[PDB]
Amino acid sequence: ETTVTQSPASLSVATGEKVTIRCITSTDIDDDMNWYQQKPGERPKLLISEGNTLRPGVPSRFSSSGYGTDFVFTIENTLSEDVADYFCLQSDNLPLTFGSGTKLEIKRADAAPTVSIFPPSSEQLTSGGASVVCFLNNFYPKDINVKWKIDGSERQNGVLNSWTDQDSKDSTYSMSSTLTLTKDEYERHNSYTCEATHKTSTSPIVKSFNRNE
Amino acid sequence: EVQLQQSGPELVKPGASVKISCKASGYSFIGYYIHWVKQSPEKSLEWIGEINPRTGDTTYNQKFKAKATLTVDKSSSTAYMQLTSLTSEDSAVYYCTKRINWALDYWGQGTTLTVSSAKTTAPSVYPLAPVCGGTTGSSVTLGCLVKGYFPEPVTLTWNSGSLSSGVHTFPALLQSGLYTLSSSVTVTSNTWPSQTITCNVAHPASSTKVDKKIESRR
Amino acid sequence: MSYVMCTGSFKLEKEVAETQHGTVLVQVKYEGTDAPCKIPFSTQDEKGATQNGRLITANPIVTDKEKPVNIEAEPPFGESYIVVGAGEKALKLSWFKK
Secondary structure (H helix, E strand, O other): OOOEEEEOOEEEEEOOOOEEEEEEEOOOOOOOEEEEEEOOOOOOEEEEEOOOEEOOOOOOOEEEEEOOOEEEEEEOOOOHHHOEEEEEEEOOOOOOEEOOOEEEEEEOOOEOOEEEEEOOOHHHHHHOEEEEEEEEEEEEOOOOEEEEEEOOEEEOOOEEEEEOOOOOOOOOEEEEEEEEEEHHHHHOOOEEEEEEEOOOOOOOEEEEEEOOO | OOEEEEOOOEEEOOOOOEEEEEEEEOOOHHHOOEEEEEEOOOOOEEEEEEEOOOOOOEEEOHHHOOOEEEEEEOOOOEEEEEEOOOOHHHOEEEEEEEEEOOEEEOOOOOEEEEEOOOOOEOOEEEEEOOOOOOOOOOEEEEEEEEEEEEOOOOEEEEHHHOOOOOEEEEEEEEEOOEEEEEEEEEEEOOOOOOOOOEEEEEEHHHOEEEEEEOOOOO | OOOOEOOOEEEEOOOOEEOOOOOEEEEEEEEOOOOOEEOOEEEEOOOOOEOOOOOOOOOOEEOOOOOOEEEEEOOOOOOEEEEEOOOOOOEEEEEOOO
16 A cells, blocks of 8 residues: 655644644655644544645645655644644545644643632432542643642542643643542541642642531 | 534444444535545544445455445435444544545544443533632632543533533543543633523433533532 | 446646647546546637547546546647536646647
């Protein structure tokens, strides 16, 4: 088959900067190269068809070039809405083959997380479980740490941390941290704390609650 | 306009078969090739094969030749793909597409196939309201915890989707054999609890729909 | 046996080449579900009227969608158009000849 090597795997640029992605083919394919964008949660969409043909309705800031084996995809004046995966597809011969993709992210100014804590709902307690949730919202960069404390004692098991894909508006990330305990375990302790450690501060952002409230 | 509507998520046991459909509308079904594409959990796209809806002629990727079978039905304008001898390697999102201008275009929404022996488990939807005391700022953050379901996917909206600004939905994660998802929403302190804010959750695999209004703790 | 006219789209596979004796070699690829079919071929003057005084390649057909077709033609002198395919989507190339 015609092998397509795409690079880089991941790329980060600031708003207004140029994005350059490339695909090299193992055989000569003229200009039968196509470019697709896939935003998180969405299906692939054709941005550019053979011969660097921009699809109708696609912003003119996307372009491409190349002929033979060396192909490039460009974003001029990259916007925050442009965060996605980008794929190339060769359409010269069967079987059709794709590049392995490029993850595009935005560089912006640092931002501390907004941290909120949530006790288990009464429905869950009725079901016999107890989950405590901390939202660490709209921060940058992506790296962040969370520490749970039950009555001042650190708890690492039963924790589920999930990061969002980069926000297409403010280029931040958010993160959800869920500590899961059994109801009995939960009702044997009073103080529940989550501490967020981020590059924006030396001291952790600490949020707590007590069962007695 | 042109549309390709695929069938819902499938949870199938290892060793069995599955058949995804793809209903076309908005154009002459007969006039264009239908192609099928696999997208692995690592987001890599592989071409599976193509079918001529006019004659039924097919061409396959050698890599999928023994696993996939493409068919069509002119009457219902529907293309089908059958995958046999299923393993966990077959778990992925499958797309159908229309080839036009020599490119694959007008992709369907995709069908999530999960190959596992685990049961279908409906999610438990829990409201996340602020701490019992105070919570006084210019705004306020509510949440919704969708816990313990299988398989993927679940969909989540806020107020039937009319409230989308200030929402963070967090990707589902597998924990103890089940998926858990959550979402937050932030609104001005005047909006809530004055105006109703409701979490809407659907789990297609179990035909579960839950509407959970976020209520104050006291 | 007897095929009907292709209803699909045609694209240039390579650039049009001319021979020493004033003919042109056209390489086209086809998009459509109706192959095997006869390729609509024509030539026009600047106005738009069909010249089609000569077509060297007899009975141009698409046998396989995946395989391109070679068509040799003899355009008139000066500015003309080579027209491959039918309808609003027909491939219309300009050409000039000594």
